[PDB]
Amino acid sequence: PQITLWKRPLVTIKIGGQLKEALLDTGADDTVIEEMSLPGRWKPKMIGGIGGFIKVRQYDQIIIEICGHKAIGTVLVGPTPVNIIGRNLLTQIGCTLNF
Amino acid sequence: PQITLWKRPLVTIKIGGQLKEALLDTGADDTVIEEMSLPGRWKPKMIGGIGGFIKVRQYDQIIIEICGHKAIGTVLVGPTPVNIIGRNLLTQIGCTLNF
Ligand SMILES: CCC[C@@]1(CCc2ccccc2)CC(O)=C([C@H](CC)c2cccc(NS(=O)(=O)c3ccc(C(F)(F)F)cn3)c2)C(=O)O1
Numbered sequence: 767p768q769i770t771l772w773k774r775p776l777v778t779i780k781i782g783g784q785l786k787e788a789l790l791d792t793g794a795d796d797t798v799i800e801e802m803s804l805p806g807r808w809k810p811k812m813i814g815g816i817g818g819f820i821k822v823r824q825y826d827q828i829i830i831e832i833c834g835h836k837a838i839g840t841v842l843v844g845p846t847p848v849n850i851i852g853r854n855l856l857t858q859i860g861c862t863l864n865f
Numbered sequence: 866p867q868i869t870l871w872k873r874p875l876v877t878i879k880i881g882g883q884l885k886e887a888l889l890d891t892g893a894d895d896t897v898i899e900e901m902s903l904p905g906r907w908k909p910k911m912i913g914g915i916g917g918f919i920k921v922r923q924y925d926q927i928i929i930e931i932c933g934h935k936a937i938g939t940v941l942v943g944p945t946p947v948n949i950i951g952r953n954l955l956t957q958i959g960c961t962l963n964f
Pocket of ligand 1: 798813816817847850896914916
């Protein structure tokens with residue numbers, strides 16, 4: 767679909783069989799999710815945002831449904847104020863910015 | 866134009882007579898620009914992001930040129946790692962998210 771930005775671009779995602787809400791963020795290189803249990807081993811990572819750096823756990827090859835679209839890639843888990851879907855998964859779903 | 870997300874969506878903007886690079890961020894409610902001089906009265910505010918909050922000065926009714934497009938609105942000035950154009954101004958230029 768086509769999404770305008772008068773409201774926050776929130777959508778529904780299915781991850782680990784759970785339904786959660788997430789923000790489509792073109793300014794984010796990566797995808798960051800709130801604390802939860804994902805399968806597999808993780809690797810450490812540190813990412814920067816508006817107010818400083820946070821430490822997260824990186825999981826590779828996680829399956830996620832975004833507005834019914836399937837994406838499979840890297841998900842970072844950490845202390846984020848909202849679930850963020852960033853560029854790494856937006857390109858998989860074919861998301862573009864138009865004006 | 867149509868912007869793909871394989872790379873960061875950075876664009877040239879004109880604010881206060883200076884030229885600058887900015888990131889188009891559909892996840893940001895507000896537009897936040899690196900410390901610079903703007904005319905007018907301002908009000909202090911705190912805005913939150915990944916990493917925590919930062920104190921910024923809020924200027925209203927500022928005119929910005931985004932990719933040759935004119936838009937008007939509130940601009941926050943502070944210690945941000947990157948210049949971010951948020952929804953407040955992306956709507957004014959007719960920017961949308963398509964998938
Ligand atoms: C992983 C996130 C990437 C990003 C920082 C970008 C970056 C780019 C390259 C180099 C360094 C850093 C981009 C992002 O959208 C924000 C956030 C929202 C999650 C952000 C950005 C701009 C301003 C805000 N303050 S706010 O009041 O406009 C606000 C508050 C809350 C939210 C919510 F929608 F996330 F709740 C949105 N906006 C937030 C941020 O803090 O980090």
